[PDB]
Amino acid sequence: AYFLDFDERALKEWRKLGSTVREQLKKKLVEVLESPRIEANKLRGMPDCYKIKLRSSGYRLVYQVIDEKVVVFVISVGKAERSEVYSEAVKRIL
């Protein structure tokens, strides 16, 4: 299993999340820690990035897998609408 870390800005997003949505993402995030490279969820663009999707929120969590630190690094949590959550993730990695 992998350890967990958050970007400072991503952790704030996490705590601002509504209760029901956070719990939904939390269950999936905990599953992710057991084995975080889930090829179906791999994001295009820079390597080692994956998403967690909800069927109808439509909130998203973006994380980077960092093997050298055995860590899942949460970089962005927010809305898929207008690709907000994804553009922020790229911005925070650069």
Residue numbers in the entry: 2 to 95
Structure paper excerpt:
Two additional crystal structures of isolated RelE further show that the C-terminal helix uses this motif to adopt multiple, defined conformations. To better assess the structural rearrangements that take place in RelE upon RelB binding, we determined the structures of isolated RelE present in the two crystal forms obtained for the isolated toxin (P21 and P212121). The structure of the P21 form was previously resolved at 2.5 Å (Neubauer et al., 2009). However, reinvestigation of this structure using better data collected to 1.8 Å revealed that although one of the three molecules in the ASU is indeed in the monomeric form reported earlier, the two other molecules dimerize via a symmetrical domain-swap interaction involving helix α3. The interaction patterns observed between helix α3 and the core domain are identical in the RelE monomer, symmetrical dimer, and one molecule of the asymmetrical dimer, whereas they differ in the other molecule. The most common interaction is characterized by a strong salt bridge between Arg93 and Glu14 in addition to multiple contacts between hydrophobic residues such as Val86 and Tyr87 (left).
The bacterial relBE locus encodes a toxin-antitoxin complex in which the toxin, RelE, is capable of cleaving mRNA in the ribosomal A site cotranslationally. The antitoxin, RelB, both binds and inhibits RelE, and regulates transcription through operator binding and conditional cooperativity controlled by RelE. Binding of RelB inhibits RelE by displacement of the C-terminal, flexible α-helix, which contains a tyrosine residue (Tyr87) that is critical for catalysis (Li et al., 2009). RelB is additionally known to dimerize through formation of a ribbon-helix-helix (RHH) DNA binding motif that allows transcriptional autoregulation through binding to the relO operator region (Li et al., 2008; Overgaard et al., 2009).
